[PDB]
Amino acid sequence: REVVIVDSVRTGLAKSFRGKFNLTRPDDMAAHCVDALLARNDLDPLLVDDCIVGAGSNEGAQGHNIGRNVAVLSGLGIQVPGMTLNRYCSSGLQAIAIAANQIASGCSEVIVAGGVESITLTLKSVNTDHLVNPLLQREVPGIYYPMGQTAEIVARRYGITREAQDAYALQSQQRMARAQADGLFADEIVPMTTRYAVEDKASGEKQVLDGVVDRDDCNRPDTTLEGLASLKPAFAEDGSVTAGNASQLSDGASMTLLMSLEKALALGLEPKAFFRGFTVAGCEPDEMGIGPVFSVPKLLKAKGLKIADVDLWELNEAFASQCLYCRDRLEIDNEKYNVNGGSIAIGHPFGMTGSRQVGHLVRELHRRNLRYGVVTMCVGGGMGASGLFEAVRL
Amino acid sequence: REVVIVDSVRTGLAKSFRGKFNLTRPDDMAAHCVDALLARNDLDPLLVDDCIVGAGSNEGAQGHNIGRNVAVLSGLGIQVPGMTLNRYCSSGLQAIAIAANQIASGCSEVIVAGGVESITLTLKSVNTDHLVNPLLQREVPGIYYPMGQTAEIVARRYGITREAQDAYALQSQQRMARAQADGLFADEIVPMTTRYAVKQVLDGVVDRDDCNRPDTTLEGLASLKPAFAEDGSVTAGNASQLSDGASMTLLMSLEKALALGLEPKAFFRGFTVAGCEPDEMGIGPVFSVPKLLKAKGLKIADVDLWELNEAFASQCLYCRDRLEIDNEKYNVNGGSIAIGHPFGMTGSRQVGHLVRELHRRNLRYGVVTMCVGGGMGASGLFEAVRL
Numbered sequence: 001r002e003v004v005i006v007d008s009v010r011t012g013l014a015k016s017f018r019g020k021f022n023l024t025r026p027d028d029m030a031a032h033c034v035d036a037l038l039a040r041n042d043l044d045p046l047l048v049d050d051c052i053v054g055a056g057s058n059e060g061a062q063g064h065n066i067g068r069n070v071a072v073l074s075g076l077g078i079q080v081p082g083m084t085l086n087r088y089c090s091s092g093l094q095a096i097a098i099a100a101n102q103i104a105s106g107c108s109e110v111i112v113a114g115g116v117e118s119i120t121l122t123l124k125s126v127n128t129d130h131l132v133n134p135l136l137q138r139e140v141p142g143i144y145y146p147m148g149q150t151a152e153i154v155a156r157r158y159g160i161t162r163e164a165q166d167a168y169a170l171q172s173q174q175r176m177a178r179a180q181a182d183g184l185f186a187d188e189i190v191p192m193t194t195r196y197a198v199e200d201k202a203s204g205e206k207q208v209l210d211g212v213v214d215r216d217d218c219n220r221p222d223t224t225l226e227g228l229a230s231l232k233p234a235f236a237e238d239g240s241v242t243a244g245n246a247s248q249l250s251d252g253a254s255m256t257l258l259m260s261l262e263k264a265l266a267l268g269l270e271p272k273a274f275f276r277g278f279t280v281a282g283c284e285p286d287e288m289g290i291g292p293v294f295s296v297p298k299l300l301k302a303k304g305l306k307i308a309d310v311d312l313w314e315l316n317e318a319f320a321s322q323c324l325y326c327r328d329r330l331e332i333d334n335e336k337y338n339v340n341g342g343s344i345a346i347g348h349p350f351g352m353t354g355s356r357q358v359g360h361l362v363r364e365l366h367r368r369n370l371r372y373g374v375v376t377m378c379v380g381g382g383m384g385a386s387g388l389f390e391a392v393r394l
Numbered sequence: 395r396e397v398v399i400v401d402s403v404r405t406g407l408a409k410s411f412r413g414k415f416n417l418t419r420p421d422d423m424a425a426h427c428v429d430a431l432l433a434r435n436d437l438d439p440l441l442v443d444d445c446i447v448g449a450g451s452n453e454g455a456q457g458h459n460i461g462r463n464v465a466v467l468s469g470l471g472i473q474v475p476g477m478t479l480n481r482y483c484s485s486g487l488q489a490i491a492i493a494a495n496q497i498a499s500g501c502s503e504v505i506v507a508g509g510v511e512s513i514t515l516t517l518k519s520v521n522t523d524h525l526v527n528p529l530l531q532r533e534v535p536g537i538y539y540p541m542g543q544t545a546e547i548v549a550r551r552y553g554i555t556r557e558a559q560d561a562y563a564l565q566s567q568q569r570m571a572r573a574q575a576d577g578l579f580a581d582e583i584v585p586m587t588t589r590y591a592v593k594q595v596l597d598g599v600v601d602r603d604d605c606n607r608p609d610t611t612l613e614g615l616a617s618l619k620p621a622f623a624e625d626g627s628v629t630a631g632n633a634s635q636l637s638d639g640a641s642m643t644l645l646m647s648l649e650k651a652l653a654l655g656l657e658p659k660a661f662f663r664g665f666t667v668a669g670c671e672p673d674e675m676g677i678g679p680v681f682s683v684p685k686l687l688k689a690k691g692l693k694i695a696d697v698d699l700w701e702l703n704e705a706f707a708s709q710c711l712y713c714r715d716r717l718e719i720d721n722e723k724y725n726v727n728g729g730s731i732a733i734g735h736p737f738g739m740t741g742s743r744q745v746g747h748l749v750r751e752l753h754r755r756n757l758r759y760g761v762v763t764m765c766v767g768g769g770m771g772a773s774g775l776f777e778a779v780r781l
Contacts (some may be wrong), residue, residue, distance in 0.1 A: 027527055050667055058452030058480060061524035064537075065480050068768040069527060071669065072534050081667040081770040083488060086452060086459050087477035094477060101495035107664040107689045125523040130455035130515055133421055133463060140466050143458075277501040280444055280475035282465065302501045381462040383475040 002261040003100045004271035004392070008114070008359025009036045009190045010254035012213040013346045016119040019218075020196045020211035021251035026055065026118040026351075027066050029192065031073035033255035034112050036190040038075045041257060041269055045075045049108035051082035052099050053255075054091025054115035056350030056380075057122035058084055066116070076112075087280070089316060089377050090385030091115045092254055093354025097278035097387060099258045104275075109263045114255035114355030123249070142285030147380050148235035148246065151319035154289040155240045158325045162240040165320035166228035169245040169344045171334075172317055176341030177221035184340055184367070188359050189215060218248045219345035245320035250347025254355035273362040276372075276388040277303050283382045289322020291384025292376040293329045299374070299386040307331060311370035314357035316377035317342040326378070339364060353377065358389065365391035396648035397494040398658035398779065402508070402746025403430045403584045404641035406600040407733045410513035413605075414590045414598035415638035420449065420456055420512040421463045423586070427642035428468035428506050430584040435644060435656055439469045443502035445476035446493050448485025448509030450737030450767075451516035452478055460510070470506075480738075483703060483764050484667070484772030485509045486641055487741025491665035491774060493645045498662075503650045508742030510640035513734075517636070536673030541767055542622030542633065545706035548676040549627045552712045556627040559707035560615035563632040563731050565721075566704055570728030571608035578727055578754075579603065582746045605635040606732040632707035637734025641742030660749040663759075663775040664690050670769045676709020678771025679763040680716045686761070686773040694718055698757035701744035703764035704729035713765070726751060740764065745776065752778040 011029055014021040021029065030053055038045055051074075053067035067082035074080075087094045092115030099113035136143050142150070154160065179185065191214035199206045223244070233239030234246060264271045279302060281294030292315055300306065313332055317323045323344075327337050340360065343353060357375040365373050371393065376386040405423055408415040415423065424447055432439055445468070447461035461476035468474075481488045486509030493505035530537050536544070548554065573579065585601035610631070620626025621633060651658045666689065668681030679702055687693060700719055704710045710731075714724050727747065730740065744762040752760045756778075763773040 025524065025527060028529070058478070059457070059521040059523075063453070063521060063525050065482060065768050068481075068770065069530055069537065072537060072672075072769075073527070073530055077669075078534060078671055078769050079669045081481075081669045081766075081772075082768075083479060083481035083667075084452070085477055085479040087462075087475070088459060098492050098495070101492070101499050102665070104499060105495050105664055107666050107686065121524050125521060127453035127457060127519060127521040129519040130419065131457050133419060133467065135422070136463060136467060140472060143463065143466060277499055278496070279501050280477075282471075282473045282475045284472055285466075299501065379475075381459050381466075381476075382472055383462065385475075 001104045001106055003103045003258055003275045004261050004264050005256060005273045005362050006259055006264055006269045006271060007037055007041055007257040008362060009033050010188060010356050010359060011192050011252040012189050013216045013218060013250035013252045013349060014213045015218050016249035016251050020194050020213045022120045022196050024194045026062055026116040026253060027069045027073055029253035030070040030116040030255060032192050033253050034070060034074035034076060037112055037255055037257045046079060047110045048076050048080050048112055050111045051076060051080055052095040052111060052113040054085050054095040054351045056086060056088045056117055058086050059127055060125040061118050061121035088380040089318060089350050090354055090379045091351045093358060093375050093385055093387050096256050096355060096358055100275035103258055103260055110259045112255050112257055115351030116253035117349030117351040118251050119249045119349055120251050140285060143381060145286055148241055150286055150288045151241045151321050152236045152239050153286050154325055155321035157287060160321045160324050164324055165240055165245040166225055168320040168324050169228055170223055170225050172341035172344040173220055173223040175339060176219045176345035179340035188363060216346040218250050218347045241319055241321055247318050247343035247348035250349050252349045252352050254352045254359060256355050256358060271392045272366060273392060274390040276390050278387045281384045285382035288380055288382045289319055289378045290325055291378035292326045292386060295384030295386040296330055296376055299388055303388055310372050310374050312339060312361055312364055312373040313337045314361045314375045316353055317344040318348060318378050320344060322378050361389055395498045395500060397497045397645055397662045398648050398651050399660045399749050400644045400646055400651050400656045400658060401431055401435055402643040402742060403427050404582055404743050404746060405586050405639040406583050407603040407605055407637035407639045408600050409605050410636035410638050414588050414600050416514045416590050418588050420510040421460055421467055423640035424464040424510040424642060425467035426584060426586050427640050428464060428470060431506055431642055431644045432469045440473060441504045442470050442474050442506055444505045445470060445474055446489040446505060446507035448479050448489040448738040450480060450482045450511055452480050453521055454519040455512055455515035482767040483737050484741055484766045485738040487745060487762050487772055487774050490643050490742060490745055494662035497645060497647050504646045506642050506644055508642035509738030511736035511738040512638045513636045513736055514638050534672060536671060537768060539673055542628055544673055544675045545628045545633060545708045546622045546626050547673050548712055549708035551674060554708045554711050558711055559627055559632040560612055562707040562711050563615055564610055564612055566728035566731040567607060567610040569726060570606045570732035573727035582750060603733040605637050605734045628706055628708055634705050634730035634735035637736055639736045639739050641739040641746055643742050643745055658779040659753060660779060661777040663777050665774045668771045672769035675767055675769045676706060676765045677712055678765040679713045679773060682771030682773040683717055683763055686775055690775055697759050697761050698723060699726060699748060699751055699760040700724045701748045701762045703740055704731040705735060705765050707731060709765050749776055
């Protein structure tokens with residue numbers, strides 16, 4: 001049974017702590033995206049069978065089964081069930097794969113799926129009771145290494161130079177700035193009205209202000225190689241990984257409307273892409289960045305494709321060090337790889353990224369009249385996740 | 395692409411707080427179940443594609459992506475990925491559904507899926523930071539009602555009497571006691587060695603469910619005080635107990651089970667969910683069950699056995715009678731009123747028990763279904779393999 005993406009919309013990505021989502025709840029952010037899918041597709045909310053929300057943090061602002069509460073806050077209401085999942089950085093893609101495979105089984109027709117992260121409200125809000133398994137810490141200490149530490153381990157282990165990382169970061173900033181100037185995000189970003197907190201550091205003046213998030217605000221079109229080369233190492237005193245060649249902390253949500261081809265047809269909605277499969281693979285936690293080099297080959301083999309058959313890649317730019325290792329280990333064409341840049345420029349709100357990448361990949365396949373794209377990403381804890389999508393060509 | 399349950403094993407359910415799992419970590423409990431699946435099926439760990447763990451709490455003792463950590467702790471190790479999910483009470487069944495649909499897609503061959511709950515280590519360990527959405531509490535206050543309050547609302551709204559609740563609770567105790575005496579949980583339960591607290595630490599063995607009371611009487615149940623309202627009908631005796639435990643299920647394509655020379659126990663035949671009013675979450679199955687039977691071309695009559703979670707006698711009676719299910723085919727070995735409802739593991743326990751009972755009674759179709767905190771029903775269809 002064939003399953004299509006009909007639509008995918010997200011918030012802008014707003015800098016965490018300081019930006020215009022710093023008081024906005026992630027449940028409300030994801031519900032706003034669901035409301036946009038309903039309005040844009042003139043969709044009867046009673047037709048939606050489920051609401052699947054991925055998130056890295058599943059507690060506090062992201063506790064109490066955020067996927068169900070997202071459904072109830074949105075126009076879907078109490079009639080539409082919902083669930084939450086965590087495969088950290090892959091969660092938004094994982095949600096979409098689960099939605100697609102549930103529709104493929106014949107037991108659902110229409111699902112909204114994606115993810116959210118309020119890094120602002122969840123990063124430093126962590127239940128530490130019994131959090132560490134002493135036996136894991138002894139057997140696989142990598143399970144508890146900070147992500148930036150694994151980014152330095154990958155740069156050193158695989159010889160990814162500072163210079164190569166900064167050349168990659170610059171490419172991401174330039175490609176993102178061009179795609180912004182060309183309006184390539186105008187259809188994927190839905191504006192959201194907020195209240196947000198400011199403090200002047202010089203006056204001590206706190207205010208809550210009225211705001212709108214209507215674009216990604218974390219990127220720096222003026223970035224230069226010399227600028228990146230001057231930055232201090234973020235994770236090791238003699239290090240290569242910096243704030244400039246690493247993904248930024250940003251807040252946001254992305255949600256994806258999936259249905260059977262049969263149902264899209266009956267509703268007179270235009271399919272944008274087919275879901276064509278998903279894989280995950282495990283690797284050493286201390287080098288979690290290399291995940292995709294294990295998950296991508298599994299996916300292409302399951303689906304009868306070679307690297308060369310893939311027209312576009314969205315491989316999450318968690319760190320230039322791992323993003324480059326994956327590109328070069330898999331021997332992917334740089335001209336087909338993160339063609340509008342990514343998380344180095346706009347940030348990585350863990351839960352949402354995979355759904356953002358799918359929504360963007362599908363629009364760019366259509367814009368370039370291409371066929372196959374892969375969304376793939378490393379995952380904290382030592383995994384790769386990979387999803388294959390196929391543009392509907394007329 | 396046909397997907398089969400090859401095996402399913404679980405811990406015993408031990409009383410939360412005072413029982414023999416009161417110092418035992420939920421990751422270690424689920425990892426124990428994975429290790430039993432590997433040993434019982436002579437299974438190379440490198441054939442396992444994923445490890446899916448459902449849990450109600452996803453923080454503290456159940457934080458840090460418990461699904462991945464269960465894989466790494468187990469004989470699976472770092473090569474096998476894992477994930478965590480929460481659809482509270484249905485999580486163990488939701489995990490199995492995801493595994494089966496993933497294998498059905500052709501992108502995996504072998505997955506371990508199930509759930510865990512340490513009520514002991516998580517019930518009172520809740521990050522309250524920004525937990526309540528004030529708009530949601532205003533629009534749908536039922537989203538935040540205690541589960542027992544929703545059980546009292548179901549008894550009141552649907553006229554499920556104290557007397558009917560108690561008679562159902564006694565049935566669960568008697569059916570559980572008979573099945574337990576006859577060894578019907580022996581194959582599914584994997585004994586676990588523990589250290590537990592009585593303030594002194596003792597060596598223990600969890601080798602069975604310890605919450606059930608075969609000596610239960612109607613007269614004893616009628617003497618209990620209401621648990622959730624001063625004028626209530628729902629009691630500790632006609633509600634699920636607090637217990638700790640884990641269940642994991644081994645799924646494969648039928649092709650792979652045959653290549654490995656393993657006996658398929660049951661086909662996975664589909665999974666539905668449905669939304670309902672949170673304040674009456676207990677009735678959720680009356681919405682999910684019809685969607686599942688309609689999707690698969692079945693009627694109530696086609697189903698030989700039901701596992702419908704005994705969260706509370708009030709809702710478990712309502713669902714049985716609203717769906718017009720024969721009590722003789724319904725929770726035939728009792729359930730959570732007798733042994734407890736460790737939220738994340740229940741669905742996997744129900745699957746593992748149902749596939750065995752279908753095989754033992756030479757029956758064809760069974761349904762695992764449950765109400766879900768937040769206002770949902772989940773329903774899964776299994777079909778015993780003819781061999």
